[PDB]
């Protein structure tokens, strides 16, 4: 078994960044690389597999390391 979670930041109800971080431990390098990719696309038009327009929204994907204690 595996869990897919969608967080639609444009929707009426989604998990807060604070609560997502409370729930999961993320590899900081993963998150940093995605953040930088978003900035590069926004500022300089640099395309990356990390940040894609899919079905009308830009998206990033994260694979949490663990459930936070």
């Amino acid at each position: 078994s595996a869990k897919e979670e969608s967080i639609d930041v444009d929707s009426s109800s989604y998990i807060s960044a604070e609560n997502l971080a409370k729930k999961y431990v993320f590899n900081p390098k993963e998150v940093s690389e995605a953040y930088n990719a978003i900035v590069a696309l926004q500022n300089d038009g640099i395309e990356s597999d990390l940040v894609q327009l899919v079905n009308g929204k830009y998206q990033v994907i994260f694979y949490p390391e663990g459930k936070r204690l």
């Binding site: 979670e5 971080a21 953040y35 949490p64």
Partner: protein, 39 residues
Amino acid sequence: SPAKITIKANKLKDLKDYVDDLKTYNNTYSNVVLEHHHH
């Protein structure tokens, strides 16, 4: 179970802001570990 988290926004600015907040909190919670050693 293994988890795959997809974060989506129509505007890059909104996606950026969510990820920026996530980055901040993820780092803060990880820093708590180091604080326990410092203190």
